[PDB]
Amino acid sequence: DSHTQFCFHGTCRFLVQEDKPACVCHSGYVGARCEHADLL
Amino acid sequence: QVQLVQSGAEVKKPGSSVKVSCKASGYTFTDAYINWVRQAPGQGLEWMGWIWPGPVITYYNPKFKGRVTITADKSTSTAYMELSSLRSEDTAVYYCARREVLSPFAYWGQGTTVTVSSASTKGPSVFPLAPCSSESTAALGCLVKDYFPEPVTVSWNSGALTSGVHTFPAVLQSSGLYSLSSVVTVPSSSLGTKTYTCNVDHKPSNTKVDKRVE
Amino acid sequence: DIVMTQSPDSLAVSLGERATINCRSSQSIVHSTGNTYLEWYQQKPGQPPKLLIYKVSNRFSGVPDRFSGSGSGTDFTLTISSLQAEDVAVYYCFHGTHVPYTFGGGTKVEIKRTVAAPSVFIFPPSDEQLKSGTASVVCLLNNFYPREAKVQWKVDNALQSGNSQESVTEQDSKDSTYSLSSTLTLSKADYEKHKVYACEVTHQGLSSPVTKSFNR
Ligand SMILES: [Zn+2]
Numbered sequence: 508d509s510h511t512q513f514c515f516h517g518t519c520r521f522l523v524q525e526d527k528p529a530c531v532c533h534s535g536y537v538g539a540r541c542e543h544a545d546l547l
Numbered sequence: 548q549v550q551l552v553q554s555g556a557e558v559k560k561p562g563s564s565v566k567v568s569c570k571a572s573g574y575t576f577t578d579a580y581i582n583w584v585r586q587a588p589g590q591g592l593e594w595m596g597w598i599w600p601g602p603v604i605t606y607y608n609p610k611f612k613g614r615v616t617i618t619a620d621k622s623t624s625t626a627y628m629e630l631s632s633l634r635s636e637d638t639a640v641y642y643c644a645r646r647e648v649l650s651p652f653a654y655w656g657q658g659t660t661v662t663v664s665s666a667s668t669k670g671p672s673v674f675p676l677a678p679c680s681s682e683s684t685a686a687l688g689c690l691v692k693d694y695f696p697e698p699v700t701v702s703w704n705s706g707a708l709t710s711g712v713h714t715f716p717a718v719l720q721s722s723g724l725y726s727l728s729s730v731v732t733v734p735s736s737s738l739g740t741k742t743y744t745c746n747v748d749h750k751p752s753n754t755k756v757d758k759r760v761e
Numbered sequence: 762d763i764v765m766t767q768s769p770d771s772l773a774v775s776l777g778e779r780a781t782i783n784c785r786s787s788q789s790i791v792h793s794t795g796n797t798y799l800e801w802y803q804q805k806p807g808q809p810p811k812l813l814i815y816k817v818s819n820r821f822s823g824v825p826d827r828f829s830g831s832g833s834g835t836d837f838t839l840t841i842s843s844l845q846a847e848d849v850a851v852y853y854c855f856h857g858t859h860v861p862y863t864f865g866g867g868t869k870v871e872i873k874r875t876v877a878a879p880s881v882f883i884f885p886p887s888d889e890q891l892k893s894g895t896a897s898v899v900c901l902l903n904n905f906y907p908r909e910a911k912v913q914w915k916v917d918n919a920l921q922s923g924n925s926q927e928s929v930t931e932q933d934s935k936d937s938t939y940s941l942s943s944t945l946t947l948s949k950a951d952y953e954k955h956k957v958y959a960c961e962v963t964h965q966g967l968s969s970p971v972t973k974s975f976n977r
Contacts, residue, residue, distance in 0.1 A: 515793065525602045527577070537606055539580070539599040540648050543860040544793070546762055547609060584810075584864075592810070592853055592864040606860050609762070613855075642809055651800045651857070653821070655809035676884040676899055679975050686882040686901055690944075692890075713903070715928035715942040728928065728942040730901055732880070748940070 517541035549573035551643055553656035558696055559663055564631040567659045571624050579599035580646040581626035583617060587639040591757075593671075597646070598626050630661075633706035638663045666695040666723045670754030673747050676730065677760055685738065687760045688730035689745035693722065701729040703744045763788055765865040767829040773873035773907070780841040782868045784854035789834050791858070799838045801830050804849045804867075806931060813852075814839065839907050844870070849932060871908075872937040878966025879905035879941075883959070883973040886952065896952035898971065900960035902941035904933065911963035911970075914945045916957050921945060952977070 508528055513519055516536035522529040532541040554568040569581060583595040598609035600619035607615050616629040630637060641661055645654035676688035691699055701714045711732040717725040729745055743757040768783035784799075791797050801814035812821045814830035817837060820879070827842040841848055849872060854865040880903040886896040902910055906927065914921035924947065930940040959974035 522602050525577070527601060529602045537604075537860055538648070539601065539604060541766070542649050543606075543790075543858075545606075545860050546788075582862075591851075592804075594862045594864055597862075598949075610859055644809075646857070649794075649796070649857075650799060650829070651798075651812050651815040651821070652802070652810070652855075653812050655811075658809055672890075672893070674887045674890045674897070676887075678882065679885050682880070684901065686880075688884070688899075688901070689886075690897055690899065692897065702880070704859040706812075713930050713940045713942075715930060715940075718926040718928055718944070720926065720946070726944065728899055728901075728944065730882075730903075730940075730942070732903060 513540065515540050518543075527534045549645065549654050551654050551656040553641075553643060553644055556699045557559065557662070559633050559661060561633055561635065561663060561665055562635050565633060565637075565661050567628045567643075567661065568640045568654050569626045569628070571626065571645065573736075574645075575625045576619075576621065578647070580648075581617070581619065582644045582646050582652065583628045584617070584642040584644060585639045586642070587636070590639075595628065600626060628690045633663045635663050639758045660697075662696055664695065664723055668752050669693065669695050669724065670749045670752035671699060671725075671727075671747065671756070673745070673756045675758055675760045676728065681735065682733055683735050685735045686732050687728055688728060689744055689747065689758060689760065690715075690730060691727040691729065691747050693720075693724040693726065694749055695724050696751050697725055698750060699725070699727055700748045700750075701727070703729075703731055704742070704744055705746055707758075708743070762857060762861055763790065763863045765854055765863045767865040767868050768852060769868045770866070772868055772870045774844045774870060775873045776846065777843045778873070780844050780848070780870055782839040782852050782854075782870075783833075784837045784839070784865050785855055786809075786835045786837075786863075787871045787918075790856050791834055795914075796858075797832065797834070798856065799830075800855045800857065801828075801855045802855060803848075803850045804853065810853065814926075834960045841870075842974060844872070846872070861945050869870075871932050874906050874937045877904060877906040877936075877938050879903055879910065879962060879964055879971075881960065881962045881971050881973040883975050885975050885977075891949055891952070894949040896947045896949065898958050899943040900943040900945075900962075902962060902964075904936060904938040904940060905964060905966060906938045907965060907969055909965065910941055911961075912941065912943045913961045913963070914916070914943070915957075915959040915961060915972075915974075916945075916947075917957050 671694035
């Protein structure tokens with residue numbers, strides 16, 4: 508969503524479900540904005 | 548304005564499950580994580596997990612082996628913490644705390660005391676603590692023995708005496724019942740003249756007691 | 762999984778004196794953005810923790826300037842410039858960089874004072890208690906410093922073990938001392954089968970261990 512950063516470790520996608528943009532985490536990352544490394 | 552309001556205390560038999568609630572107010576509920584921390588007596592702090600209520604996301608402390616469940620009620624701005632297969636070790640003050648993305652635990656709930664016991668509500672047996680007869684000082688007290696659950700209050704001479712009063716934290720005995728000892732250092736002289744009476748209250752069993760120590 | 766290790770454990774510092782709490786992560790705790798989500802909390806008894814420091818070195822709004830955090834990738838420290846009566850609590854470091862989140866063990870800060878020997882008192886079990894079929898012999902350790910004290914119960918020179926529980930008051934608000942209560946617990950039978958009940962107190966303040974005894 509523009510050049511103002513939202514998701515950390517992932518791709519941004521619109522959740523028409525909750526009507527707010529969500530983050531699609533890449534492997535080994537968790538969180539609402541994919542901000543954490545999952546050490547497990 | 549930002550408030551985290553937890554539900555009241557619980558007593559849960561071993562093996563059962565406990566749901567602790569957390570009403571969150573003063574911010575958008577779908578815009579912060581609701582974390583859970585616990586603290587067993589004398590023990591430090593233990594993070595249990597978190598919940599993002601928006602497009603619902605959780606992460607729990609593995610050391611719990613999936614006994615903890617964190618749910619969120621979008622409609623009523625509450626996040627619940629369910630802990631199954633209760634053990635004596637699960638006796639603790641459960642806390643919830645607010646966390647914005649990569650931000651700290653700025654807000655906390657007051658805490659919820661969950662006591663895991665097979666024991667039943669029994670008011671205490673108050674006993675006197677007097678010596679069988681120095682620097683002109685003497686000591687005397689009250690043994691508040693065998694009670695459940697934990698909250699018992701002790702004053703001396705109905706709040707008149709505060710000076711030299713030492714009310715010891717309770718101890719969980721082998722019986723699974725609590726024991727507390729309340730003392731007071733007093734001058735030797737005053738003894739036969741002035742009176743020292745301990746006032747015990749165990750609200751959970753509506754046991755109010757007064758014992759005059761000699 | 763990260764292991765946060767607090768080095769001091771228990772710290773006794775005089776009023777106005779400097780207090781340093783150390784914390785250590787087992788693995789690097791630097792986030793991908795180059796920030797380190799290490800925070801300090803202060804907790805007082807029967808109260809939820811309070812945020813002190815966040816992002817290693819940032820003082821939270823409303824926290825006195827005496828409190829300051831600093832660190833290096835795995836090693837971190839909380840500093841109090843001049844200790845105040847209000848600063849007596851348990852301090853916890855926290856790692857929120859990676860999941861799972863981790864709390865440190867905690868560090869108790871108490872007011873360091875002059876050694877004060879305890880005043881010892883033994884109490885017999887009440888006749889009202891004896892009637893019920895159990896005995897509770899109590900030993901009181903009054904206004905002492907430091908918190909380290911040894912209490913050995915002797916039933917006719919037979920050193921006791923497994924049959925006593927101990928309790929400690931928090932550091933005193935007016936004299937910065939501690940107080941300890943020990944309860945030896947026996948049945949009517951075993952109590953009414955011995956004469957001498959003694960309580961031996963070993964503590965820094967005392968030259969030799971002070972005994973307080975009674976005869977059934
Ligand atoms: Zn990445």
